[PDB]
Write a protein that binds this ligand. Structure first.
Ligand SMILES: *[C@@H]1O[C@H](CO)[C@@H](O[C@@H]2O[C@H](CO)[C@@H](O)[C@H](O)[C@H]2NC(C)=O)[C@H](O)[C@H]1NC(C)=O
Ligand SMILES: CC(C)Cn1c(CN)c(-c2ccccc2)c2cc(OCC(N)=O)ccc2c1=O
Ligand SMILES: CC(C)Cn1c(CN)c(-c2ccccc2)c2cc(OCC(N)=O)ccc2c1=O
Ligand SMILES: *[C@@H]1O[C@H](CO)[C@@H](O)[C@H](O)[C@H]1NC(C)=O
Ligand SMILES: *[C@@H]1O[C@H](CO)[C@@H](O)[C@H](O)[C@H]1NC(C)=O
Ligand SMILES: *[C@@H]1O[C@H](CO)[C@@H](O)[C@H](O)[C@H]1NC(C)=O
Ligand SMILES: *[C@@H]1O[C@H](CO)[C@@H](O)[C@H](O)[C@H]1NC(C)=O
Lengths: 727, 725, 74
């Protein structure tokens, strides 16, 4: 009867149920029922309680998160959560002995701890505090201070700086244990010459003078952080003598100039692989490094370096892929672009130079999910040549041509997007299915790939959504220059092709973006389609990912070009499909998306009536180096300055006279700096263009506060409705 | 059938001509002639051209300045504006006779202020925060101070808050009447906290700049000041020049205080007024030079006090003294026994001064003093607070005072100011309305009309082809009080129609938005083109009506002046030619604060509104201004009200209205923060509203392009809220 | 040692020791005062006081001080 409303989205009436489980052995996993944390037995299920939540309510603090020690004897308890960037944060930690049943109170983990992590086995603890690394062998024993050089905003031992957090490691951590917890490897980042982004934080109305936040953030072409790499031995620490870490230096060809550490993987108890990437990110090296008893050093034999490079563009999707070492560490698998430009699993031998690809085709392997001695498990979009589908496949190691699809047929109508979570030795797996139907969580045995059970099937959301006129998603493609390009449309209920519907274009379109997939979603578009009868569409054109390098490297050294043109074309195609009102076509987006939106509105295409740019990039010199330069190279006369000059939103200001524009940016945005929009606004003022604006005080790139999140969508809704003369 | 459109306003299509002159002597002044500058004789009328000034043979000249004697001209160029008054420039000097530049010992680049002595051609400037003196344009400078440090010690120049709020000037230098002494103030912002904001700059600036200004918000550590005099004669070259400190009096040294006036009395007499930080108490000191000491001594008997039990002292500061020639006497405008501001003749010895004027109106300022007459401006005529006229008063006999301007032009001219000739033999009358402005030159010899300098007949001519709006000034009585208002009324105003009303509000202490001044502004376009009545209303807090009215909001900003703008709208709608359903309200600064507070009131009267660079809570705005009216924000003083008078606290009530919040990001004055906190408040209660920031625009939002942009954006908003196509 | 001289501010209700009326007593060759700084004896108006201090020759003698001048007279 009644539709999917804005308040439905905003307040979250129609909940989507997860099933977040944590493997701990090969046979078992931890779930949270009614707060009470239970343990389940994948074989059968005689799954009694693990840690009743009647325990930690006289704790006197909020149990933000937890973490069991691998051997199962203790429980790290996170509290005092204070978010820093996307991944980073600090918090307080108490440990609790499960066997002795009390909480440890001596040699405690300090307030304001930046990162904690158990050893992978047993119960050693490594943690970072005030930029230095500390190690505990037992919870109740004093820490061994591994590093004495940490300094706020300058030297970061065992944690990443801003740009390595957001762009390189996608994590605050820079600590990697060896598989049996003997060695602790870590990165040190030095930011001395990394200039600072400065911006006002206004805080509560009680703060009289605005605070000036200062983050080291290398914008395109600026001095970058430098990186060093160390491994220290945690079984040979001492009270009397300072623990001495051994540096593994980067290979010759990387030291010759600016570079990054971009991956760390242990192959064995005594072998580590490091991947370094040049500042110009088309050349990368993997070093295989071995511990030497007699010296106590690590040798990274030149003869076992493995070069990965790109001629058409950059290496990796966003970074070179991670290797997956065989048990003995003498060989590994990783996804690399093949001679056709398609990303596929390649088997490498430590000593040998050339790999053997064991997958191929015009589709891409997304990730290697597990390796046993008998099977390699991976995710790809092979199925039905849908680049926006995801499925689990297993390769038979004894003959790689024997490949089975585990998830393809399980429920093909409901389920075409899949992720997977394997038990410790891979003997069991949870399949998570994200669409096109309602999410479905199910448990499986690897032995037969027998379907054991449904963990969550969201029937509650179902027997509930039937009384709501939902939109329909259509995932399909159009053909431009012999190439398939895909798009999705959220279509209003009772969609009629006789009618001219107004159209909004939801755009990301950044390199390796993919906005056309089989994922099911409840969001703003669901509202715009269900209530307002607006077709929200998205289109993956050139630059977009998981469709090979020819498509993805098409925007190489040329951001703000093909990905922009392709969005204008998708509109033209959607108009030519005959069920779109040409007079009411809008375009909006966020980040890259807001840049494209802004570039499109400033293009003089005439296709678009209005648009909304939320935290847009306006000029690539303003964005961080690791991302921007991957695509744009350096902004110098000797590299790519002219196109940096050409690809700005500001230079198209004059043509915003042809559209209606809403520019929204949060003031405490550490990622895409408010600057970027402050410069768009200014350019528009200087040529006499009128437009809507909205700042969000103290909000960051997510504009994610409850009350801010609601405000922004409400404000964007009014703008759209008005652009489209909706009542 | 053409109207005064938005673009007419924006592009200055209908220009008001001025007759801005300056008196080189008692008989002659200077006037611009497109680019040329002529020397008009006020007596006969004949003149002679002297220069061609607007880029003069390599730079473009921003301003000029004649040395009293007429021997040297000072050329100002490379003007770089700082705050409301402060700026920086390069300066060159000419031997005004030989017309040749003084090439040697050039006045340095980046000079913060320069000034001639009042007689001769002595030159005092400030540079890198220190005072320098030049007895000749070609001789090297003598350096008066050495303690100048950027953002910390200001020798001879003001800091942010003195500039804006106390002196309304950058300079803190004062030459003696005969160029022998240079008195100056030195300010210390060492423990004054910095407001910090980002400055984004040209788009080629990759990293935004943080601007840091020492700025005392309400309650913060204020600056401190010391005062000095130095003999500019006897200025040794082999030794640093000694400077004689006149210290503040004991009563002020007890606590935080300011220097709020500096007036020379004779060659050897100088008067200083100091204000307690709680500005209900001030003190004047008269200081004679001691020839036998080299020093300055001010007597305790000679001291005077300016008390205020009902509010603060002054309008914005204690009024300045005008000394008779001898220096044993002076006249000062002050609040009389029952509230009204009048001229008081003081003898230096005693305290008791007797008032030379009385009545239910204020004197607005003393303009000229001579041996036998004192000339002043006031709003007595027809009991109109918004009128200005020039009155001559008989020092010999106080009952006998003639109005000079009142009757010259009744209908055209109710708002005069005046500029007197170097001595007073002649004077200029500026008439600013209510008709088109009129500039006329008078002989004070027999108070006779000599000639019309500019009558604006050019603008008159082309305004007859334009359907201009009408202006109605008048009052309404509330609680037996006369409360004045003005209305800009669409042409052909038929009051059996129902027009929409835009309430234009400042409403801050001592404001006057209802006056007899002719204006070509955004309101002209609104009434002429959009047929909107724009109105203002001088409620409690407004000035020039006595302290009863003005002190009404003392320690109580955010109360009665807000409440009184609302009954204003009720009264206007009661007049029967307003659309109840389309009454809007807008203001800048204080007006922004009041607009917001009204929109926050829940009154139901206003449909929508625009606040531009509004104050949002008084703890954010500067100490000097805020505290005068609010006091300190401490539980032992007035914290409770500071908390109760914020716009943030009324966010929930913005659910009833349409709001447009505009603010410039580089506002040094009312900080972006203030609007950042309004928005966050509004976000957190879930109130939707319109927003616009202006990147790198200060409180003026005065850039050509942003001025244009703001007014267009605000027109669109008003039109839409009013349903005007 | 520093002697302060503080006046009651009538309207303020507070006390205020003007720095112009601070008086320094210090010793170049030892400590100040015999066992401590000598107490002052004020004139009726309190504009002035007498005080035992060491003179330029080391001998303690009655110095006559003005509330406002640094210098005294023995
Ligand atoms: C400006 O004022 C500051 C105090 O606000 C003065 O600096 C005190 O100065 C003394 C004497 O040099 C130092 O021993 C203190 O430690 C200073 N305090 C601080 C906070 O700086 C400064 O000397 C004044 N300068 C002038 C020219 O008046
Ligand atoms: C790639 C990761 C290492 C980090 N990363 C980055 C890089 N900083 C960006 C991004 C791209 C360009 C400009 C600013 C941010 C990003 C943008 C997203 O936008 C979604 C949309 N617009 O619909 C979602 C996720 C991501 C993200 O995960
Ligand atoms: C008092 C002077 C020494 C300086 N000064 C100040 C300093 N406080 C303010 C002002 C008042 C409160 C808040 C921010 C600024 C001001 C406001 C004006 O408002 C225009 C209007 N709203 O119609 C016009 C002039 C002035 C002005 O001259
Ligand atoms: C912080 O942690 C310390 C010890 O690490 C603990 O004793 C204390 O209660 C915590 N709180 C504060 C306010 O320091
Ligand atoms: C960090 O900064 C500089 C390099 O620019 C160097 O002088 C210093 O040695 C480095 N510090 C550490 C701890 O590596
Ligand atoms: C460890 O190194 C630090 C920093 O160099 C030094 O000050 C100290 O002597 C050493 N501490 C221990 C416990 O050996
Ligand atoms: C861990 O690995 C180290 C280094 O290979 C080895 O010497 C040690 O025996 C291993 N520890 C355990 C408990 O297996």
């Amino acid at each position: 009867r009644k539709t999917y409303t804005l308040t439905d989205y905003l307040k979250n009436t129609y909940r989507l149920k997860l099933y977040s489980l944590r493997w701990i052995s090969d046979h078992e996993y931890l779930y949270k029922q009614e707060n009470n944390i239970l343990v389940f037995n994948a074989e059968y299920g005689n799954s009694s309680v693990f840690l009743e939540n009647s325990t930690f309510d006289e704790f006197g603090h909020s149990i933000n998160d937890y973490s069991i020690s691998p051997d199962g004897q203790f429980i790290l308890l996170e509290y005092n959560y204070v978010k820093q960037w996307r991944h980073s944060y600090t918090a307080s930690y108490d440990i609790y002995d499960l066997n002795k049943r009390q909480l440890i109170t001596e040699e405690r983990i300090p307030n304001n701890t930046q990162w904690v992590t158990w050893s992978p086995v047993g119960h050693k603890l490594a943690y970072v505090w005030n930029n230095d690394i500390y190690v505990k062998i037992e919870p109740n024993l004093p820490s061994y201070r591994i590093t004495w050089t940490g300094k706020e905003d300058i030297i970061y031992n065992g944690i990443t700086d801003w740009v390595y957090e957001e762009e390189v490691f996608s994590a605050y951590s820079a600590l990697w244990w060896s598989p049996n917890g003997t060695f602790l490897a870590y990165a040190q980042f030095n930011d001395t010459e990394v200039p600072l982004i400065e911006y006002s934080f206004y805080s509560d109305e009680s703060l009289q003078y605005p605070k000036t936040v200062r983050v080291p953030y290398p914008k395109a072409g600026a001095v970058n952080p430098t990186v060093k790499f160390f491994v220290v031995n945690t079984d040979s620490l001492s009270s009397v003598t300072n623990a001495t870490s051994i540096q593994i230096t980067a290979p010759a060809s990387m030291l010759i100039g600016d570079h990054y550490l971009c991956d760390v993987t242990w192959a064995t108890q005594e072998r580590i692989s490091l991947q370094w990437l040049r500042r110009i990110q088309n050349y990368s090296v993997m070093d295989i490094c071995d511990y030497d008893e007699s010296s106590g050093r690590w040798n990274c034999l030149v003869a076992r370096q493995h070069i990965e490079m790109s001629t058409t563009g950059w290496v990796g999707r966003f970074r070179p892929s991670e290797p997956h070492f065989t048990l003995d560490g003498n060989s590994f698998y990783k996804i690399i672009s093949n001679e056709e430009g398609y990303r596929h699993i390649c088997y490498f031998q430590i000593d040998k130079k050339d790999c053997t690809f064991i997958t191929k085709g015009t589709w891409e392997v997304i990730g290697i999910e597990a390796l046993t001695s008998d099977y390699l498990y991976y995710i790809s979009n092979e199925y039905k040549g849908m680049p926006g589908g995801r499925n689990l496949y297993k390769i038979q190691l004894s003959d790689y041509t024997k490949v089975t699809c585990l998830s393809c047929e399980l429920n093909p109508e409901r389920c075409q997007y899949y992720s997977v979570s394997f038990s410790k030795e891979a003997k069991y797996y949870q399949l998570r299915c994200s669409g096109p139907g309602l999410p479905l969580y199910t448990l499986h045995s690897s032995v037969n790939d027998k379907g054991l059970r449904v963990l969550e099937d969201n029937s509650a959301l179902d027997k509930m959504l039937q009384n709501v006129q939902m939109p329909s998603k259509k995932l399909d493609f159009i053909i431009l220059n012999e190439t398939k390009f895909w798009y999705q449309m959220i279509l209003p209920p009772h969609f009629d092709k006789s009618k001219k519907y107004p159209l909004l274009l939801d755009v990301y379109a950044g390199p390796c973006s993919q906005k056309a997939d089989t994922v099911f979603r409840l969001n703003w578009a669901t509202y715009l389609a269900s209530t307002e009868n607006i077709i929200v569409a998205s289109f993956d054109g050139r630059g977009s990912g998981y469709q090979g390098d020819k498509i993805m490297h098409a925007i190489n050294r040329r951001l703000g070009t093909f990905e922009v043109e392709d969005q204008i074309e998708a509109a033209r195609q959607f108009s030519k499909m005959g069920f779109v009102d040409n007079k009411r076509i809008a375009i909006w987006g966020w980040s890259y998306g807001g840049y494209v939106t802004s570039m499109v509105l400033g293009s003089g295409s005439g296709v678009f009536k209005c648009g909304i740019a939320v935290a847009p990039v306006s000029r690539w010199e303003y964005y961080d180096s690791v991302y921007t330069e991957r695509y744009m190279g350096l902004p110098t006369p000797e590299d790519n300055l002219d196109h940096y000059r050409n690809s700005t939103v500001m230079s198209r200001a004059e043509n915003f006279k042809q559209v209606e524009y809403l520019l929204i940016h949060g003031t405490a945005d550490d990622n895409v700096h408010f600057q970027q929009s402050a410069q768009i606004s200014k350019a528009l003022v200087d040529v006499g263009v009128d437009f809507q604006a909205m700042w969000y005080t103290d909000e960051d790139h997510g504009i994610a506060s409850s009350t801010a999140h609601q405000h922004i969508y409400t404000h964007m809704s009014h703008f759209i409705k008005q652009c489209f003369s909706l009542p």
